[PDB]
Design an enzyme around this catalytic site. Structure first.
Site, mmCIF file in Angstrom:
data_model
loop_
_atom_site.group_PDB
_atom_site.id
_atom_site.type_symbol
_atom_site.label_atom_id
_atom_site.label_comp_id
_atom_site.label_asym_id
_atom_site.label_seq_id
_atom_site.Cartn_x
_atom_site.Cartn_y
_atom_site.Cartn_z
ATOM 1 C CB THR D 256 10.621 7.038 -4.224
ATOM 2 O OG1 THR D 256 10.967 6.854 -5.597
ATOM 3 C CG2 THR D 256 9.656 5.940 -3.785
ATOM 4 C CB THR D 257 6.685 9.539 -0.823
ATOM 5 O OG1 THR D 257 7.420 10.767 -0.931
ATOM 6 C CG2 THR D 257 6.081 9.438 0.566
#
Ligand code: NA
Lengths: 344, 344, 344, 344
Positions: D256-257
């Site tokens: 996840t970013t």
């Protein structure tokens, strides 16, 4: 009687049943005919003062099945609320010159192509990227109500545009509404509906509602009576579907409506989009159930962006009484009248 | 009389008015109090048989404001239908161990964090990949209906979870419903609502409906009567908002509801999602207008995936009488009952 | 060289400019001609082994313009990632018998209706509820690359379906790719592209990528070199758009790609949907900028649901090495190859 | 060397490995410690001139885990692109006074509540109908890079707000970036990343990019080199994930970013929303793979609405050179720089 008595127009829905009949397959398709587009006139014409908004409707008698086209020549900002589980749709642009509603299920999307092509010709084939003539289309599945596989094709869509005129809409069995039906717990109880429109002017504020109800559910009036769909010929009664569902569960589990709301009130893309959702949901009052997995329910909300609402929502009726939500609520009643016109 | 008479249970909504009073701004917040969570018991306690589903509700008298938590220990597949234009939502996961409903507007999302933290402790702080204790939260703005800025904080959410017991729900002014109100065309006509629930078992099929109605619109019964909201003290009448909106436009333009449906019927992600939308839209019958730009309407549809529907929809009541749509429609009436209990 | 060196196959993209020429947004339309459908063969034929998947391509020389049809006779589950700001899409069903890509902007959506009509004829016009032959279509605006207004019509779509054969794809200027172009910071630097496809088999796993790049941005290879679009004839250099944009802002503000990925790996709706988005976003590597408001970028992810991935994602290469994400990343490279073939 | 060479700032990424170690669960949580917030200072301080935009960052050593808060006191219009398949989001409002990014997975959303509650207290608990202080939050799961279950709680979010200062951002291991990591085909090859920020002024145009990359994929530079993530200690090489995936399939399937872009350029809600998508997708250049089912990738695009772009897009660099697509491309490069600063 009830809270909405004083805004009800007393539409005279015909109590007489019109069952759609059994599903009979083997019928002839488009290639079995030299199809002749017929102008749809319906049971009655609605005429209304909304400059810039034209409507055309055409059908094939072979079906019968048709298309209904809302033409706004200047183009208008649009929000789409596709809420059903079985939506057949083309374009869905946020700006449209025409909205094409048609029978024939997914095949009827071809009618809308007929409209866009015709509009390109009328533009004499100018192809600027900011010059596109945009057409959004939605369809209902009306093959169940008839023993033919004829579907609104390119030619019928073109005809519908050609038959478009300012300020008029054919009520009843016309255009996309030719073989629309309601109440589909069992096809034995399914009734033909039609298409419907209604219009209101409030000062300079204009609201047009167009609907082609082909619901799994039934059409109901403001008194809460089922007036179209789920008619049992043995009892002569139209029961709310939930009673059939209830009983079906006790036995077996023991322990599409396409519509348009067109207004001239300026709304931002976010206001317009929420307006669309509010009015669409309000239709679960007149159609029950609604927004079901079986339905492809799609409402278009269109504004010509001609008049502004006041900068502040205030009036003698309240601090929050003049805004988009107030409008969507005035518009919800116009749409209900349109639904009752389709079921009349 | 009307089509739904035979499924109406005769909930006795109280004619007596309960206006919220005018908006008084400038009250003390949480900082001004040593806030002590009170367990909510409401005007009455609904009891139901739904193993695996618990409810807790807590409030601060200093508000008054509160939180209501649905706790499903084993976790349950969820769909979220966030329809309004003013949604306050945290998490929104497709699988949840708790749903947290609270007042306090956006600030009240903190109560859901209190629940997730408390659940993490209970799991002795396990944080493995598949071990998330997931909490979805939604809020209503209930500051209008009181003269205090106290909101449901982390502590209150935790309390609500701790107060959670199987098969009980406090009706009325309890938990998130402590300062819920309806009918906001003008704050002078606004009435206190409350929270409500209803339950139905059909064979093994179970359906629980929870609702905290803080609508812009008003609550209406199956007869079409406005029974809560927009009460005019001078006339003693609750008119449908559209009449106020109508007159407001003539004069000035001259020419949130958070809810959950919890069931045990197995539904695929697609079915559960469409089921949520159907039930949510159905609420525009009991609340009008609904899904407006002013509302942050959010419904959670939750299934414990414990019983199957037949592989085919057929029954003696019709070929399409046993499916998710049928269930959503049975569920729609449970939810209307819940809305009436809140407005009772 | 670079991280991807060992996966690149040294596609020989022609250094030679092919500017589209100044845009005359207009010209003779479909009525000015007697349009004769021409089976597309492009510059080269890609041949692949993927049973059940056929491809047809047709064009009108009078455009030039065309349509490419992917025909999966058995029908296949589909996810649509319509990410651009100017999408032209019809149908968008989660299960398709054909995908139709075409030029002609929105007008070209008509080609898809030709395919669905044909398919209904082939089914000798059965209209059973579950018998629909479903076609999804997307379009590119290719009127700027030619002095004509001819667009892919019903007939051309039908031809493309008719010319469809197993395991063959016409690379280059063929079908929808006849007048595709790239690099549109100014039309003076815009180059013709074409359509492209690549294919990979991994054991029994198959992955087919089809793309019609008509970007606002430019095509770039794995080395980070601009190889098609934004060619400045004065300098002989294709700069990255960002340098033009950069200069433009200093000066003036002082202080569509349509594609399909087809695989035989079983994926759930959620997995297929996320697979679609992943592969689509990966194309911003080979096309820059991408997913812009000016683009109508649309990717279809189609699975024939024939082979299962292991129940667990582990292998000697890691605990999370065999799953849909792994596949979407193997697929991303296939699609980049297709993009480079289109720009070759 | 490559098309973007001239826009590259030669960020000195450290070649040295910083493996995160394997996931090891069962560690102590917040109740085991007397947690006190630390102002994160990271490795290096970025200073920038963007009046009205502040940034605070706090962490608990005991995690190590933290929160990073973007505070825009005046409030700013926001669009949210939540692409990934594992998203954790609170609020997601289209207007925000703060954006809170934090570790601790879903539990870390609690830090956002700490911000909102603190802002309310600053407003002195003014609960005006439109005086809401809105905070949107997103999280990464960083429990796999540390042997503790400590998560960013209400107190830490408050602290990050209280530490907020104009025009300063702490690069590297700071705030939400304390235990962020990349490259998760296998945990043994996962590397610590950090958080990063970049800033550019063009005339009066201002673009701030903030990113907290916790990708399944790896960080790559403009030359196409893998610079952080998937480091094999046995080979000393960071391969592109696709090679591991490719080999995994051969072996096991045989035949996840969270980020924010903040600008002062006025954009309409529709422009801002598509701007967000474009910039977000551009990040698949510096992070590969990206937008996967395993990622909860969420980008906030925020505008302070201070400068107008010209009414026409023309410049000497082309007809379509000055618009939101041009800005989203200039912004893309600022975001890439911020990704590299995080991986440095
Ligand atoms: Na502690």
């Amino acid at each position: 009687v009830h809270a909405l008595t004083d805004i009800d127009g007393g539409i005279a829905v015909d109590p007489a049943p019109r069952l759609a009949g059994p599903p009979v397959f083997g019928g002839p398709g488009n290639d079995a005919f030299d199809l002749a587009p017929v102008r749809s006139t319906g049971r009655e014409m609605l005429r209304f003062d909304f400059p810039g908004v034209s409507i055309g409707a055409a059908h094939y008698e072979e079906g019968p099945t048709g298309a209904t086209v809302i033409h706004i020549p200047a183009g208008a900002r649009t929000a789409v609320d596709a809420r059903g589980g079985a939506v057949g749709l083309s374009g869905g642009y946020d700006f449209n010159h025409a909205i094409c509603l048609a029978g024939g299920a997914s095949y009827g999307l071809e009618a809308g192509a007929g409209v866009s092509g015709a509009l390109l010709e009328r533009l004499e084939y100018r192809t600027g990227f900011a010059e596109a003539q945009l057409v959004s289309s939605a369809v209902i599945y009306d093959f169940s109500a008839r023993s033919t596989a004829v579907y609104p094709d390119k030619a019928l869509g073109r005809a519908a545009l050609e038959f478009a005129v300012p300020g008029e809409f054919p009520q009843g069995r016309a255009g996309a509404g030719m073989s629309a039906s309601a109440g589909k717990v069992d096809w034995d109880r399914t009734e033909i509906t039609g298409q419907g429109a209604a219009f209101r002017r409030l000062g300079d504020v204009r609201i047009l509602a167009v609907v082609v109800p082909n619901p799994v559910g039934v059409i109901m009036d403001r008194a809460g009576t089922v007036v179209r769909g789920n008619y049992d010929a043995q009892t002569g009664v139209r029961r709310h579907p939930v009673f059939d569902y209830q009983e079906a569960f006790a036995e077996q589990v023991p322990p599409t409506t396409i519509s348009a709301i067109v207004t001239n009130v300026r709304m931002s893309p976010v206001e317009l989009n929420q307006f669309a959702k509010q009015v669409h949901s309000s239709m679960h009052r007149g159609i029950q159930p609604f927004h079901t997995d079986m339905d492809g329910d799609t409402l278009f909300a269109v504004t010509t962006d001609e008049i502004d609402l006041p900068t502040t929502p205030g009036s003698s009726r309240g601090r929050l009484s003049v805004n988009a939500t107030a409008l969507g609520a005035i518009a919800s009643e116009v749409m209900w009248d349109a639904v009752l016109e389709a079921g009349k």
